[PDB]
Every structure is written in C-alpha cells, then in structure tokens.
Structure 1
Amino acid sequence: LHSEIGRLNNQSLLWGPYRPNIYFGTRPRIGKSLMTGLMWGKIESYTDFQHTVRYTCEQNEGMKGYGWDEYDPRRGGIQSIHDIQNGLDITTSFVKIPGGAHGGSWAARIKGTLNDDAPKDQKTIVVFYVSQEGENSELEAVPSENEFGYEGDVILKGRSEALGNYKLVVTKGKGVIPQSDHDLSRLRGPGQTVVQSLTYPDEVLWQAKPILFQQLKAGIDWLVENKYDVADPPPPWQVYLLANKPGSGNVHIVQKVFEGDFEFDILFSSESAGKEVTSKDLEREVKQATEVFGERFARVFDLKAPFQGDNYKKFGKSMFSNLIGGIGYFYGHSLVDRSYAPEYDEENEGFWEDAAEARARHQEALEGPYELFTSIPSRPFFPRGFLWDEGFHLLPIADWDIDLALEIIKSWYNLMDEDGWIAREQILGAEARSKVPKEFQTQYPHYANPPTLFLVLDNFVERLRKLDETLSTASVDNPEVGLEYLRRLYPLLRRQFDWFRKTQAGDIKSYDREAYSTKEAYRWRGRTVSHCLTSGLDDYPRPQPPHPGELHVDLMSWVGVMVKSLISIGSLLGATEDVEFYTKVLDAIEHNLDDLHWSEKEGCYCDATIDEFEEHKLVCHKGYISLFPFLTGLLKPDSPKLGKLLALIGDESELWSPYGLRSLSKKDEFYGTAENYWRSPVWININYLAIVQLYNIATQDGPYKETARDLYTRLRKNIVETVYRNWEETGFAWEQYNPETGKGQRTQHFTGWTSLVVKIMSGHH
C-alpha cells in the first residue's frame, strides 16, 4: 500500500509551473521533457524590445513587484505581475486537471491589462516558447489555413515515452491585433499570430531569449537584403514579427502582438485522459481551485490574536503562496571538487591559505546528472535549493501538505553521496549555472550546513504519533505508510549523522581540555578569516584567527538536534542497538555543551579556541550563536542556564529590539561592522526558533513559565508586525530587518524563510 500512495503522489505532483526562475513557465518532474515559458515586452521603437522584453525573474526600479496570490502545487494558482517598465498588470492562472496515465492535463490563462500610465495604444509583443528534449520524441505545429500565420488557435501535437500523446493549444485570445498597411504586408501579412518551428541540440533549448533573438535578427537581416529601409520602414512591431514557418522541431515559438489589453489561454491535453481541455474547463477549475485554497488556508493557517483581521489574512496568504509557489524542479550536472585534497582537513594553523591553494588547483568537474524538487529562497536572486533554508521552508509547507514536504525531503536525501554529504547549494544544469558566477559554483564535500531538515521530520513524527485532500495527509493518516517512509530514509539520516561526526569533528584530546566526554566536540570546516559560510551565519564573529582547535557551539547543538531525531525515529523502527548509542551521545553533548561552551562570567554559551599559550579559551560574542542550545531545544525547562539566556534574550541593550532579536548584541565590538550581514540585523528564521522555544517554556509547569510567556507574546508580536508593515509598504518579504528602523533590507522576494511568519501567526506549536 506504501507504493500505492507513492504512485498517486507522483501522478498528483508531476506537472507544475516548476520554473520559479522565470516569470511564468511549466515543466514536469522529468529531466528531459516538455517545457514552456512566457515572454512579453512593449515595443515603441526599432531598438527597444531587446531592453524591455521580460523572461527571467529580476527585481529593479522597472518592476513594482510580482508573486503568487494563491498556490497549491497539486491544483495550481494565480500569479500577479506589476511591470512599470512595460506599463502592464499581468495575471497568469495555472490549473491542473487529473486524468489518464501521464500525470494529467493543465491550462493557463495569460491576462495583461495596461496600467493608467501606459499609452492606450501600446503595442505589446507576447511569446509563448515551447521546447522538448528527448531522442525519440516529436512535436509538431499544425499549419494554419491562412497564408501568413494564424487567425485562430495554434495546435501543437506531440509525443514522448514520458508523456504519451498530447496536444498543446495556444488560443486566438482576445484583444486588438494591429494591422500594417506597409508594402511588407504583401509578403509578411498585415499582422497575425505566427509560429516558428525550429531544432537545436537538446542541451541549449533552455536558452529561450537568445534563440528568440537569433530568429528576430534573421527576420531583420531579410528586411535589409530585400530593400526594406529607412526611406520607408515598416512599423517596429511588424519588423519584430517573425515570418510564419510552423513545422516539426524541438523548439516552437508562438508570437502575438497586441494593441491595448489582451488575453489568451494555453491548453495542455493529455491524450490518455478524458476528452481534451477547453477554455470553459480552465475557468471552472480556476474558480474551484480558489474555493479549495480558501478553505484549506482558514483551517491550516488559522491566524490567532491579534492577527485575526482580514489585513493579516491577506498578508498570510501572500507570504504562504510565495513560499510554496517558489517550488521548482531542477535537473542537470553540478560542479564538485572531488580531489579531497588534504588541505581540506584544515588541521594546521593558517589552514585557510592551504585550502585556497588546493582551490587554485581547479580539480572540480561536472557530475550527475541530478534532479531536485525543492522550494527556494529567492526567485530573482537565487532560485535554487539551499540546504538549511529548506528546513525552514518546509515548516509551513508541511502544515499545508505533509506529503508534499516528505516528497521534498526525499528529493533532497536522494542527492546524498556514499559518505553522507549533500551540497549546501544545489546548482543543477546549465540553466541554473547561468545565474551564478563560475567562482561560486564549485561545491566542496567537506562543507556542511545546518541539518534543519531534521526539524521538519520531528514535526512529521509528532503528527504520526498523534483525492488531493486525502493525498496531502496520506503519510500521517496511514501509520504504516508513515513508518515505511521513515524506514527507507532512516539509514540516510544515520549516514548524515556519522558524516558530521567524521568530517566536522573538533579536537578535545590533544589540548589541555577537560570534559565529561572525549568524543563530543565540533568545528565547521570551511572557515575564512572573516567568514563561516557553512554555518549559515556568514559573517557572525568567530574566534580570530580561525584555528584547528576552534569549537563551535551552534554546530554541537545541531548534532544534538540530530541525535534527538534519530532517537524518535530509531524508536519508531525498533533499532534498539542504535537508540542506545544515540542515548549516550546525547547525554555526552548535554554535559559537553556546558563543559566546553558555557561561560559563567558572561552568562551565555560561547564558541571556543585555543590561545597563543595553547590553552582552551572561550570567545564570547553575544547574539544568535550564544542562545544556540536554547534555540535547538536542548535545555531542560528548569535550567538556570536557560533562565540566564532568557535574561539575555529580553535585554534591550543586548539582543531585544522593538523589531525582533538582533543577530548580534549592540554591546559586541563587532556590532554593525563590515558587511553587517549577521552582525546586527533581525533574521526571521532564528527569531522563529526563539519564538517556538519561548512558547515551549511558556506552556509547561516550571520557574520561567511566565517570563517566557511574556517574551513569547512580545516577540511574536514584534516579528509579525515588522514583516507585515514592510509588506504593506513595499509589497515584499525581505531577507532581514533593520533593528533601529524596522526597515526591510538586503534582498526582496525572500520567500524564503521570512514566510515562517504565517506559522508564527497561526501559533499553537
């Protein structure tokens, strides 16, 4: 029965607008298959369209904003795009229609409305670009009756092993289509929908912009050769209209020019399903998906006081939809240094210079292919999987649809190599690579990242202990399906745990170091003079200079998170021998957190190094790092140390701002220095962990119950209101927030763990 859910999940999830790197496109969860994408741009001159055309996501002064108003990857949703440059408010509605054997059907409506500023007679070029990869697959544009192009719909018929037979229609649409009275119209037509059917080697089909422009340039070259010139030139929009040439190929460009408002549909009909998809079908499924979305949100994300107001519901729906709407399918080779150069063991003083030397060998090479199905932090700036980010992304998503979240965990775990490594940053295929400087592509098998995905697993486990609707919870409602999932994953979890212990081990046994355990001690590999990227907290201050005897309290805590998870899941599976080992590791981490990292003098946890004199030294820098054993759920509720941390947490002159907790204390000498990334600003992911843990102390008999209850109340309020106010003013989720001004800063469209705010509002942890 397990593989029954599995099959239904696969069929449910296969199609999606799973290209969050572009404004709008579709692809299925198959490496080499059919992909679509949308392009549009005003044209007002002979040279403007190249600068105005939109395709890949960006965020600059020319774009007011854009994002998903509703979305569920099983059903589809609606996206809004507000484009200042092209004077256009666009809606793209996408809906899936279950059926047949090939993952069903889908449909999209593209609606564009000129805004108030745009010339009412604006000419907007619109392209629907379709490509198919695979050796034994075919796709063909049925030619038009009319001479120079299409008066009605464009029908592509295609076939592949993966999709069986299918038709993809781009409808005639509604809106004025301009008409040219130039001489050229005798050869090019007065103006109509056109199709070019082309073929290129499979691996470049993703390069839609250049492919398109190469075609436009050949049309213009043809104008020149054929005596169309500046003495009497055709209008711009006709100069940029491709000559109609439909046929068969692995690329099909469908182009329309509109004057004023426009709309058209795309209907993908799987032959193996019922009858084919119509526009009436699209409208009906669109209405139905909203109703369903509406009802799930109010049940799953029931906002509690003082956020019950409709303004906060709208806010929550925006933050949620953007997070789950960023879900992508990525496919291809990634770039990995597999030298395991000895310099990467970072055993010497000065190891960062050695490691640079090894990086200068450039032994990295492409490997795979791999696939990933994942949510992403940022459509415009980093539309790809990041390992500890996904732990945060899946917490609201798991509420919504636990089976989807397990899907994404499974996809991430399927990347793990034989040693237990998963690269922190998944840049799959040339399309993904295009967005990323060559110097930052290389992944390193010695680089860890926080195992925040175990948090999602912990949530799953609690739920397991205590048709699209049915499917979304199948893995918790069917206990045996749940345990079977956990059974197949468990070895990989254990693999990762061991990998942490082998690759990120700290050195106790060879300095003057006394502690309950000789084993438990950890140091993040990959540290430079000013950075520790693998920790997730890029530039939070660490011992200077970096040193092979460093120990990092955040890393030990993460290992604590992992043991606790392995205990639960191990118990569920009866791995009795494993559970006893874990039990002793936990007990050891508990003692060793204190013996190696507790500072009585400072009242908080600290990273440690070894002195110029060769002795163990704590290096205390009050901020997120300092609260780690607390944030990761490792302290007993009665713990005096906890109490001291609650004081640090609440102290306005250290961490507590009106806007959330400061990454670093105002008292720290590194406050607001250098790039100031993790050296003062307020970060929603760490604030979320604080909030969940405060709530935990607050809902149990103990000495800090009422302190935690007050801090919980205030911090929930602070964090939610800061994120909300910024969204209200700017339309955006931001990456971090300024503790002096409350302004969002760094990157916009960060959905992205900022969206945790929906879970903070809905509460009851």
Structure 2
Amino acid sequence: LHSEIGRLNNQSLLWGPYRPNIYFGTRPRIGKSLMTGLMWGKIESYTDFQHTVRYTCEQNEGMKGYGWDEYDPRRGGIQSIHDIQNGLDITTSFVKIPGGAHGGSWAARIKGTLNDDAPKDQKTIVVFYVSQEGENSELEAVPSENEFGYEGDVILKGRSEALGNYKLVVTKGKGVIPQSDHDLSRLRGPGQTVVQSLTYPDEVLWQAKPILFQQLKAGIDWLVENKYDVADPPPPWQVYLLANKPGSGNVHIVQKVFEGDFEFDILFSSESAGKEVTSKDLEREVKQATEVFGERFARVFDLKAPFQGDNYKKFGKSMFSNLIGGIGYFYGHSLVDRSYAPEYDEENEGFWEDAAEARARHQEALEGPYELFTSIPSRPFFPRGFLWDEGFHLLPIADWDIDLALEIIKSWYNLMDEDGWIAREQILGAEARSKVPKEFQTQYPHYANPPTLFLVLDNFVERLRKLDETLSTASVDNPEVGLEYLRRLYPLLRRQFDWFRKTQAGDIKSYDREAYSTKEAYRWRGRTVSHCLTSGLDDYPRPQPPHPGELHVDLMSWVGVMVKSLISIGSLLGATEDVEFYTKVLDAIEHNLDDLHWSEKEGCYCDATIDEFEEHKLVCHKGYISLFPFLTGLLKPDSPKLGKLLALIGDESELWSPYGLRSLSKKDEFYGTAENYWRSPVWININYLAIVQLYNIATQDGPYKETARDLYTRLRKNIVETVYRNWEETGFAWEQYNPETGKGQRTQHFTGWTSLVVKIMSGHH
C-alpha cells in the first residue's frame, strides 16, 4: 500500500507549469518529454519586436509585476502579468484534469488586455512554442484546409513512450486579426494563424527565442530576395508572420497576430483518458479550482489578529501562491570538481590561497544527468534549487500539502552522493546553466550548507506523533505510510549526519583547548578572507584572518538540529544502538557549546579562533550568529543564558529595529560595512526562526514566559507589517529589508523565504 499512495502521487503531480524561469509554460516531471512555452510582443516597427518580445522572466522598469494569484500544483491556478512596455495585462489560467494512465489532461487560457496607455489598435504577436525530446516519439501538426494557414484550431497529434497518445490543441481564439492589403498577401495570405514544424537536435530544443528568430530572419530574407523592398513595403506585422509549413518535427511554432484585445486556449488531451478536453471544460475546472483554493486557504492559513482583514488575506494569498507557484522540474548534468584536491583540506594557515589554486586547475566535469523537483528563491534571478533555502520554502508548503513537501524532500535527498554530500546549488541542464555566470557553476564536494531541510522533517514527525484532498495528507493520515517514508530516508540523513562530522570538524585536541567533550567542534570549509558562502550568512563578520583553528557556533547548532531529528526519527523506528549514540553526541554538544562558544564578558555565544600566540580566543559579533543556539531550539526554557539573549534581541541599541531583528548589531564595528548582505539588514528567514522560538518560550510554565510574549507579539507585528507595506507599495517580496528605512532591497520576486510571512501571520507554531 505504501507504493499505492506513491503511485497516486506520481500521477497527481506529473503535469505542472513547472518552468518557473519563463513567464508561462508547461512540462511534466520527465527528463526528456513534451515542453511548452508562451511568448508575446507588440510590433510597432520593422525592428522593434526583437526588443519587445517576452519569454524568460526578468525584472526591470519595463515590467510592473507578475505572479500567481492562486495556485495548487495539483489543480492549477491563475497568473497575472502586468507588462508596461507592451501595454498589456496578461492572465494565464492553468488547470489539470485527472484522467487516464499517463498523468491526466490539462488546459490553459491566455488572455491579453491592452491597458489604458496602449494604442487601441496595437498589433501584438503571440507565439505558443512546443517541443518534444526522445528517440521514439512523434509530433505532427494536422495541416489546415485553408491555403496559407489556419482559419480556426491548430491540432497537434503526438505519441511518446512516456505520455502515450495525446493531442494538443491551440484554439482559434477571440480577437480582431489584422488583414493586409499588400501584394504579399497573394503568397502569404492577408493574415491568419500559422504553424511551422521543425526538427533540431534534442539538446537545443530549449533555446526557443533563437530558434524562433532564426525563422523570422529566414522569412525576412525571403522577402528581400523576392523583390519586396522600401518602394512598397508590407506592414511590419505581416513581415513577422511566418510562412505556414505544418508537419512533423520535434519543434512546432504556432503564431497568432492580434489587433487589440485577445484570448485563446491550449487543450492537452490524454488519449488514454475519457473524451478530449474542451474549452467549456477549462472554464468549469478553473472556477472549481478557485473555490477549493479559497476553502483550503481559510483552513490552512487562518490569519490571526491584527491581520484578520481582507487586505492581509490578499497579501497572504499572494506570498503563498508565488512561493508554491515557483516549483519547477529540472533535468540535466551538474558541474562538479571531483578532483578532491589536498588543498581543499584547508589545514594550512593561508589555506584560501591554496584552495584558490586547486580551483584554477579546473578539473570539474559534467555528470548525471539528474532530476530535481523543487521550489525556488526567485523566478527572475534564481530559478534553481538552493539547499538551505529549501528548508524554509517547505515550511508553508508542508502546511498546505505535506505529501508534496515530502516529494520535494525525497527529490533533494536523491541528489546525495556516496559520501553524503548534496551540492548547495543545483544547476541541472544547459537551460539552467544559461542564466548562471561561469564562475559560480562548479559545485564542490567539500562545501556544506545549513541542514534546514531537517526542520521540515521536524514538522512531519510532530504531525505524525499526533482525492486531491486525500493525497495532500495521506502520509500523515496513514501512519504505516508515514513511517515507511522515514524508514527509507533515515540512512541518508544518517549518512549526511556523518558527512558533516567527517568534513566539517574543528580542532580541539591539537590546541590549548579544554571542554566536556573532545569530539564535538565544527568549522565551515569554504571560507575566504571576508566570506563564508557555505554557512549561508555569506558576509557576516568572522574571525580574522580565517584559520584552521576556527570553530563556528552556527555550524555546531545545526548539528544539534540534526542530532535531535535523528533521535526523534530513530525512536520512531526503534534504532536502539543509534538513538544512544545520538544522545551521547547531543549531551556533548550542549556542554561544548557552553565550553567552547559561550562568552561571559559579552553574555551571548560567539565564534572562535586561535591567537597570534596560539591560544583559544572567542570573537563576538553581536548578531544573528550570536543567537544561534537559541534560533535552533537548543536551550532549555529555564536557562539563564536564554535570559541574556532575550536581552540582546530586545535591545533597541543592538539588534532591535522597528522593522525586525538586524542581521548584525549597530554596536558592532562592522555594522553597515562592505557589501552589507548580513551586516545590518533584516532577513525574514532568521527573524522567522526567532519568532518561533519566542513563541515556544512564551507558551510554557517558566521564568521568561512574559518577556517572551512581549517580544513575539512585537516582532510578529514588525515583520509582517514591513513585508506588507513593501508589497502594497512595490508589489514584490524582497530578499532583505533595510533596518533604517524599512524598504525592501536586493532581489525582487523573492518567494523565496520571504513567503514565510504567511506562517508568521497564521501563528499556532
């Protein structure tokens, strides 16, 4: 029965608009299969279309905003695109019809409304692009009855081993289509829908913009050869109509030209299900999906005061939809240095100089291919998987559909190598690579990343202890199924636990260092003079200069996070001998945290080095790190240490801003310095951690209960209000928030862990 629920998940999830990197497109969770993509662009001149056409997501002055208003990966949703440069408001409704053996049918409606500042007679080119990968698959445009193209529907008939027999329909649509009076119209027709059927080698099918322009250039070239010139030129929009050439190939371009407003449907019908999907079907299914989404949101995201209002529900719905709407499917080779150079051991002083040099050898090679099914931090800037980012993304998603979360966990853990390493950044496929500057492509098997995924596993277990509808929760409702998942997964967690210990261990036994345990002490590999990429808090101030003697309090606490999860998961499966070792390791970390990291002079935890005279120095920079053992849920509520920390959090002159907790205290000499990623600004992800911990202290018999309650109340308000104000003003979620002015800065469309704000509003942690 485990594989039963599994088999039904595969099916429910297989289709999706899983191409977050582009404005709108669909592809299933299969590496080499059928992919679609939408392009549009105004045409005012003979040259302008190359600059206007939209495809892959961007964010600039040209585009106001965009994203999902509602979205379930199981049902579909609705997307709003507000395009200034093209005078266009676009709606993409996507919807999935369960049926057959192949993962259902699906449908989409593309609706374009000129805004007020567009000419009422604007000519807009629209392209739906369709490609298929595989050796023994076939896709064919049924040709038109009319001479030069299509007066109505365009029907694609295809077959693959993966999808079986299907047909894809691009409907006639509503809207004025411009007619041309020119001599050209004898040969090209006056204006109609047109199709071109091409074949390219599979590996380039994704490069749709160039493929398209290659045809457009080909057409213009033809005009020039055939004596169409400046004496009597055809109108621009007719020059950019492709000559109709339907047939079979791995690439089909469907082109429409519209005058004024327009809309059209795409209907994908699985042969193996009932009768085909019709426009009346899509309308019905859309409407019902909206209602189910409405209903679930109220249950799962019941916003507590003072955020019960409609304004905040709209905002909550947008933060969530964007987060879960950003899920994509990725497939391709990763780029790895398997050289395992000695210099990456980082055991000499000046080790960054060494490791720099090993990198310059360039022994990295492509490998895989691999698949990953994941949410992303940002459609326009970061449409790929990030290791620690995902722990936070899944916290709201877990709430909404735990089975989907567990699917994403499973996907991530399938990337783990023999040693128990997952690359912190998953760039699978040339399409993913296309958007990444070469310097950042190569992954390194000695680079760690905060095990934030464990945090979601935490939520699962607590839920465990205590049809679309059914499947979302199936893995908690049916605990035989629940435990089986954790059974298969456990080894890999354990492997990763050990991996941390083998590769990210610090030195006690070789230094002027005493502590309750000699085993437990951790250091991030990867670190450069000014940076520590692998910790996540890339430019948070660290010991100077970097040094193999370092120990890093954040890292230690992350290990704490894992031991606690393994303990809990171990119990659930009765790994006697295993639980015991974890309990030893835990007990040690608690003691050693205090021994190695706690400062009495400073009343908070700190990082550590060894000196210009070879003894153990603590180095305190009041900030997020300083709070780490707290943020990670490692302190007993009655702890005095807890006390002095809550002092630090609450302290206006240190961390406490009107807008949330500052990455780093104003008292620190490094406040506001360098590039200032983590040297002041406000981060929803760390603030989220704090808020959860406060609430835990605040709902327990214990001596801080009431200092906790005041802090949770005020932080929760501060954080939500900043994200909201900024969303209201700019329509975006932002990567971080200015501590002085409250303004969103850095990466827009960051959904992204800024979406955690729906979980902050809905309380009950």
TM-score by length of 2: 1.00
Distance, in Å, in 2 between the alignment partners of 1:624 and 1:682 is 10
Distance, in Å, in 2 between the alignment partners of 1:145 and 1:538 is 61
1:618 paired residue number = 618
Deviation of 1:618 (Å) = 0.4
1:757 paired residue number = 757
- Which segments of 5 or more consecutive residues in structure 1 lack a partner in the other structure? none
Distance, in Å, in 1 between the alignment partners of 2:438 and 2:626 is 35
Q: Which string of whole-angstrom CA distances, capped at 9 and with x for unpartnered residues, describes residues 319-370 of structure 1?
A: 0000000000000001000000000010000000000000000000000000
Distance, in Å, in 2 between the alignment partners of 1:229 and 1:566 is 74
Deviation of 1:438 (Å) = 1.0
Distance, in Å, in 2 between the alignment partners of 1:552 and 1:227 is 73
Deviation of 1:632 (Å) = 0.1
Distance, in Å, in 2 between the alignment partners of 1:518 and 1:280 is 70
Distance, in Å, in 2 between the alignment partners of 1:418 and 1:101 is 35
Q: Which string of whole-angstrom CA distances, capped at 9 and with x for unpartnered residues, describes residues 118-149 of structure 1?
A: 00000000000000000000000000000000
Q: Secondary structure at the match of 2:746?
A: strand
Q: Secondary structure at the match of 1:718?
A: helix
**2:22 aligned with 1:22:** yes
Distance, in Å, in 1 between the alignment partners of 2:38 and 2:495 is 42
1:518 paired residue number = 518
Distance, in Å, in 2 between the alignment partners of 1:612 and 1:162 is 64
Distance, in Å, in 2 between the alignment partners of 1:232 and 1:446 is 66
Distance, in Å, in 2 between the alignment partners of 1:364 and 1:487 is 34
Distance, in Å, in 2 between the alignment partners of 1:530 and 1:230 is 60
Deviation of 1:655 (Å) = 0.2
Q: Which string of whole-angstrom CA distances, capped at 9 and with x for unpartnered residues, describes residues 77-105 of structure 1?
A: 00000000000000000000000000000
Deviation of 1:569 (Å) = 0.2
1:121 paired residue number = 121
Distance, in Å, in 1 between the alignment partners of 2:615 and 2:591 is 20
Q: 1:440-479 residue pairs with structure 2 within 5 A?
A: 440-479=440-479
Deviation of 1:21 (Å) = 0.3
Q: Secondary structure at the match of 2:27?
A: strand
Distance, in Å, in 2 between the alignment partners of 1:455 and 1:148 is 59
Distance, in Å, in 2 between the alignment partners of 1:535 and 1:510 is 24
Deviation of 1:270 (Å) = 0.2
Deviation of 1:239 (Å) = 0.4
Q: Which string of whole-angstrom CA distances, capped at 9 and with x for unpartnered residues, describes residues 277-328 of structure 1?
A: 0000000000000000000000000000100000000000000000000000
Distance, in Å, in 1 between the alignment partners of 2:495 and 2:75 is 35
Q: Which string of whole-angstrom CA distances, capped at 9 and with x for unpartnered residues, describes residues 36-72 of structure 1?
A: 0000000000000000000000000000000000000
Distance, in Å, in 2 between the alignment partners of 1:345 and 1:277 is 59
Distance, in Å, in 1 between the alignment partners of 2:657 and 2:740 is 8
2:694 paired residue number = 694
Q: Which string of whole-angstrom CA distances, capped at 9 and with x for unpartnered residues, describes residues 163-193 of structure 1?
A: 0000000000000000000000000000000
Q: Which string of whole-angstrom CA distances, capped at 9 and with x for unpartnered residues, describes residues 585-618 of structure 1?
A: 0000000000000000001000000001000000
Q: Secondary structure at the match of 1:238?
A: helix
Deviation of 1:223 (Å) = 0.4
**2:675 aligned with 1:667:** no
Runs of 4+ in 1 over 6 A off after TM superposition: none
Q: Secondary structure at the match of 1:96?
A: strand
Q: Secondary structure at the match of 2:26?
A: strand
Aligned residue pairs, count: 765
Q: Which string of whole-angstrom CA distances, capped at 9 and with x for unpartnered residues, describes residues 631-667 of structure 1?
A: 0000000000000000000000000000000000001
1:103 paired residue number = 103
Q: Secondary structure at the match of 1:90?
A: strand
Q: Which string of whole-angstrom CA distances, capped at 9 and with x for unpartnered residues, describes residues 731-756 of structure 1?
A: 00000000100000001000000000
Distance, in Å, in 2 between the alignment partners of 1:534 and 1:153 is 52
Distance, in Å, in 2 between the alignment partners of 1:640 and 1:7 is 51
2:11 paired residue number = 11
Q: Which string of whole-angstrom CA distances, capped at 9 and with x for unpartnered residues, describes residues 653-694 of structure 1?
A: 000000000000001000000100000000000000000000
Distance, in Å, in 2 between the alignment partners of 1:643 and 1:187 is 83
Distance, in Å, in 2 between the alignment partners of 1:387 and 1:552 is 19
Deviation of 1:222 (Å) = 0.2
Deviation of 1:73 (Å) = 0.2
Distance, in Å, in 2 between the alignment partners of 1:678 and 1:23 is 31
Q: Which string of whole-angstrom CA distances, capped at 9 and with x for unpartnered residues, describes residues 456-495 of structure 1?
A: 0000000000000000000000001000000000000000
Deviation of 1:516 (Å) = 0.3
2:51 paired residue number = 51
Q: Which string of whole-angstrom CA distances, capped at 9 and with x for unpartnered residues, describes residues 365-399 of structure 1?
A: 00000000000000000100000000000000000
Q: Which string of whole-angstrom CA distances, capped at 9 and with x for unpartnered residues, describes residues 248-289 of structure 1?
A: 000000000000000000000000000000000000000000
Distance, in Å, in 2 between the alignment partners of 1:696 and 1:418 is 38
Q: Secondary structure at the match of 1:312?
A: helix
Distance, in Å, in 2 between the alignment partners of 1:682 and 1:419 is 35
Q: Which string of whole-angstrom CA distances, capped at 9 and with x for unpartnered residues, describes residues 702-749 of structure 1?
A: 010000000000000000000000000000000000010000000100
Q: Secondary structure at the match of 1:27?
A: coil
Deviation of 1:230 (Å) = 0.8
Distance, in Å, in 2 between the alignment partners of 1:609 and 1:240 is 65
Distance, in Å, in 2 between the alignment partners of 1:689 and 1:539 is 19
Distance, in Å, in 1 between the alignment partners of 2:646 and 2:15 is 47
Q: Secondary structure at the match of 2:680?
A: coil
Q: Secondary structure at the match of 1:331?
A: strand
Q: Secondary structure at the match of 2:245?
A: coil
Distance, in Å, in 1 between the alignment partners of 2:438 and 2:620 is 36
Q: 1:404-415 residue pairs with structure 2 within 5 A?
A: 404-415=404-415
Distance, in Å, in 1 between the alignment partners of 2:81 and 2:125 is 16
Deviation of 1:106 (Å) = 0.4
Distance, in Å, in 2 between the alignment partners of 1:319 and 1:570 is 35
1:149 paired residue number = 149
Q: 1:345-364 residue pairs with structure 2 within 5 A?
A: 345-364=345-364
Distance, in Å, in 2 between the alignment partners of 1:517 and 1:124 is 70
Q: Which string of whole-angstrom CA distances, capped at 9 and with x for unpartnered residues, describes residues 426-467 of structure 1?
A: 000000000001111000000000000000000000000000
Q: Secondary structure at the match of 1:353?
A: helix
Q: Which string of whole-angstrom CA distances, capped at 9 and with x for unpartnered residues, describes residues 187-230 of structure 1?
A: 00000000000000000000000000000000000000000011
1:726 paired residue number = 726
Distance, in Å, in 1 between the alignment partners of 2:181 and 2:273 is 45
Q: Secondary structure at the match of 2:492?
A: helix
1:228 paired residue number = 228
Distance, in Å, in 2 between the alignment partners of 1:278 and 1:214 is 33
Q: Secondary structure at the match of 1:28?
A: coil
Deviation of 1:701 (Å) = 0.5
**2:255 aligned with 1:255:** yes
Deviation of 1:627 (Å) = 0.1
Distance, in Å, in 2 between the alignment partners of 1:463 and 1:367 is 38
1:394 paired residue number = 394
